[PDB]
Design a protein around this ligand. Sequence first.
Ligand SMILES: [Ca+2]
Ligand code: NA
Lengths: 275, 63
Amino acid sequence: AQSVPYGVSQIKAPALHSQGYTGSNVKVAVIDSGIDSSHPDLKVAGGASMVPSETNPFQDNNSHGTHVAGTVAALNNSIGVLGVAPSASLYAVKVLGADGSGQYSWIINGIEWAIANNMDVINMSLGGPSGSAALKAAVDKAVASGVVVVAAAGNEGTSGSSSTVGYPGKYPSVIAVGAVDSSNQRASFSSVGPELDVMAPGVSIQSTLPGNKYGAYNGTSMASPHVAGAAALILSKHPNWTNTQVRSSLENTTTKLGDSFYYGKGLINVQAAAQ
Amino acid sequence: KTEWPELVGKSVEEAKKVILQDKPAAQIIVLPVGTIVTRSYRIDRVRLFVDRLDNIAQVPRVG
Ligand SMILES: [Ca+2]
Ligand code: NA
């Protein structure tokens, strides 16, 4: 039996599916710890590993990349969960190792692979508190090349009036995604600041895990792929829209939630965004 | 309880002593300052980010 995680419904993805738009032929790179391609609820289209000692991107020794991938594109079938964009072409771009961490140069290599391979969407459920000029250059290059680039805002909560949005989310070229729960309330951990762009469900998100398993986790890591999946739904309906158009469409049709410091533009609504 | 501003500049063993007193189930992970990490929020985890001298460089928090 298949279940639809609340977050998928909350962003109105099933409205798109019912119209016949499920992300077909849109290339989404999950730049993360790999994806367990043996999961029966996932189809991985391709990928590459940038992690020197973990060279198979189709093995996920951590679990995080597999969960993130299932939110983007868990298959529409009779098992497990349903992804936001269940027909999307999912690419395992492994830049984190088994312990869930990576070097900046591995991330940058993953971003460069996604650009060279003409990905339509990049999801980065990762980050760090300081950027680097090289990391900024790579995401800016991706956007200039036409890639919709989405990233977790961070889980650093509040710090007086200071931004706690981490990198690469904090870069203007990158859509920084914060986390809400099923009542659209901000998760206490969700990073804040003027760089917060939109929110998506990021609390008790049920998705795929290695070993043909499922479980529910919290984080802006879980929020980000709802938006990467939404980008894919939009592009499956409107294959000629630019990354600029997909981005404004998502930002302009949100359900407004509150103060932009804490909630950005509010909750994405992919039904409204796709028209 | 979720963050430890008083541990900035402390050693790793120092940081672990205060964390484990406040939060005995903590799963403590030590990483260099300039590392990329996942954005899952894991209630039992405390990441410790360290400078060149192996001291706490960022306010430790749960997640
Ligand atoms: Ca399924
Ligand atoms: Na203020």
